[PDB]
Amino acid sequence: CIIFFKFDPRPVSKNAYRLILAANRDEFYSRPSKLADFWGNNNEILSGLDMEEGKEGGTWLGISTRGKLAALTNYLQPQLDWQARGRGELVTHFLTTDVDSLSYLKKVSMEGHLYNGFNLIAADLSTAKGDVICYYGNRGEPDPIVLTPGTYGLSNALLETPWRKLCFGKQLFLEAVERSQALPKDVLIASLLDVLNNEEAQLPDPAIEDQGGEYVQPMLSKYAAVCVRCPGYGTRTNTIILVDADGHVTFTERSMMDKDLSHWETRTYEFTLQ
Numbered sequence: 001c002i003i004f005f006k007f008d009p010r011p012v013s014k015n016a017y018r019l020i021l022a023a024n025r026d027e028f029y030s031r032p033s034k035l036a037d038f039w040g041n042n043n044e045i046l047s048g049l050d051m052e053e054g055k056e057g058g059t060w061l062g063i064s065t066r067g068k069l070a071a072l073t074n075y076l077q078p079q080l081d082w083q084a085r086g087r088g089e090l091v092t093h094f095l096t097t098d099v100d101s102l103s104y105l106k107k108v109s110m111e112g113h114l115y116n117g118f119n120l121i122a123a124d125l126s127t128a129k130g131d132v133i134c135y136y137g138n139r140g141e142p143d144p145i146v147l148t149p150g151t152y153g154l155s156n157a158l159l160e161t162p163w164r165k166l167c168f169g170k171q172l173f174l175e176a177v178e179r180s181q182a183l184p185k186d187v188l189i190a191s192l193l194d195v196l197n198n199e200e201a202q203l204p205d206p207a208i209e210d211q212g213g214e215y216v217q218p219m220l221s222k223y224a225a226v227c228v229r230c231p232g233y234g235t236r237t238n239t240i241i242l243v244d245a246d247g248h249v250t251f252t253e254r255s256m257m258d259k260d261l262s263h264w265e266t267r268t269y270e271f272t273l274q
């Protein structure tokens with residue numbers, strides 16, 4: 001997976017963005033999924049949904065109109081514990097409750113050892129109270145942290161781990177934002193989808209080889225790009241989330257459909273926070 005996001009809780013102007021987010025979901029093409037749409041008690045949650053048997057309803061990225069957002073990435077491991085809890089519930093359980101992001105991540109860190117490796121972003125979006133973005137991963141430091149405003153990158157290492165794909169993609173993300181963020185939001189979205197589909201592998205990457213060990217060796221040539229194109233595994237979903245100063249949300253999701261890489265479906269939802 002890989003996520004880039006700029007976060008500015010006190011925007012200086014009227015049409016600035018409190019959040020610009022661009023995320024790729026890398027997964028085996030066999031895993032069933034549902035395209036983004038509104039669900040929950042009051043149709044108040046927006047996200048895709050995993051449909052793996054025994055894991056239905058999980059998700060990797062979502063936003064609620066109540067002003068909540070969270071995202072998860074897997075920690076690249078040479079081996080997997082198959083008896084542990086699914087990680088799909090970490091994002092879902094945040095979007096379906098009323099806990100503040102920092103308090104939720106503190107609960108998760110007490111239970112972090114029951115999952116395979118994961119990184120977790122949880123965010124409170126409040127036009128009035130002020131935005132908060134926190135981060136916790138069960139393979140890094142035990143205590144969740146409150147992030148200062150800025151541009152962040154997160155992949156299958158920890159937050160800001162200097163993988164070359166993360167550094168290079170973050171450079172493209174900043175260039176796209178500086179290039180077109182003052183233009184209509186549609187061109188910014190197109191610029192970021194172009195970044196998310198950049199397939200230039202950034203190699204050699206000793207950090208990826210060391211962490212992934214033997215499992216990543218046959219994937220390496222393709223794994224070290226923003227957009228991963230491996231045999232039966234890679235970038236299936238591009239997701240752009242924008243929140244401007246006044247609270248207008250734009251949620252775009254381009255999804256691979258036929259698994260022939262020529263059939264794609266893109267859904268965009270424009271709405272407003274409460």
Ligand SMILES: [Cl-]
Pocket residue numbers: none
């Ligand atoms: Cl259809």
